Symmetry: C2
Subunit: 153 residues, 2 copies
């Protein structure tokens, strides 16, 4: 199964995030290319609950968290299903890469098809901050760009 | 269950299409508001197979047709699941309305969540034209705007 989200916004940030998952129990491969970010930085990257674009990136809602866990790093056992950590940007403000994830799925009751991908303007503290907010959003800040995840082939 | 598609394009056409379905076997209520269309006209309106926005409205692919039927009117037994016929535009180029449909679903194997809604620049001939093309696209023409269908609440 393949899916894709086209990230758009009014802040100079844009990109494309592709997803591929063979079967429900297998890892989903997430690959991305995002331009216009601050250079030489780390930016929060997550799947948000709703694929609602009626109000910029605000209507995407919170991090997708069907299991009601706290915000964490992708490698943490305790994390939101949608937690993809930080993406590193180069000297030109480009973030490009790919990784495998076993919580994110394109098949089943937790499918992210129809939800949203959000790239943040700040660094995700991975739930390790001194705040209640750290455990919610990772203090990743603003949402310069986002896109609804659609099914493709 | 609720879903929504925000229609965007570079042709002056834009809008929002909302979907609501209680349970799989029940009709889905489709409501829409679309601006910037030709005034006093009828414009093709359908759900396309892919929620892929990488190439304008082209990447949405063909009309969603899992049952491999020919293109028809919404009230025809023989139609594509995605066939929503024509939407009427007023003197200001606005199309606004709502209808119930029993083939379009937000639940199950034929769910349209993650697919796309496309509003056309021409009138849909409802598969009643003298062509092979009529049975495919209804000769609805260009796709000035489209949006991926996302899950909301
Ligand atoms: Cu986020
Ligand atoms: Cu169409
Ligand atoms: Zn989170
Ligand atoms: Zn059709």
């Amino acid at each position: 199964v393949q899916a894709v989200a086209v990230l758009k916004g009014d802040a100079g940030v844009s990109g494309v995030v592709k997803f591929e998952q063979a079967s429900e129990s297998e890892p989903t491969t997430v690959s991305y290319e995002i331009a216009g970010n601050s250079p030489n930085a780390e930016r929060g990257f997550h799947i948000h609950e709703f694929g609602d674009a009626t109000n910029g990136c605000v209507s995407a809602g919170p991090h997708f968290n069907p299991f009601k866990k706290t915000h964490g790093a992708p490698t943490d056992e305790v994390r939101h299903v949608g937690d993809m950590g930080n993406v590193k940007t180069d000297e030109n403000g480009v973030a490009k890469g790919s990784f495998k994830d076993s919580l994110i799925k394109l098949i089943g009751p937790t499918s992210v098809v129809g939800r949203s991908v959000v790239i943040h303007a700040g660094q995700d503290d991975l739930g390790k901050g001194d705040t209640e907010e750290s455990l919610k959003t990772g203090n990743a800040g603003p949402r310069p760009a986002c896109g609804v995840i659609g099914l493709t082939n």
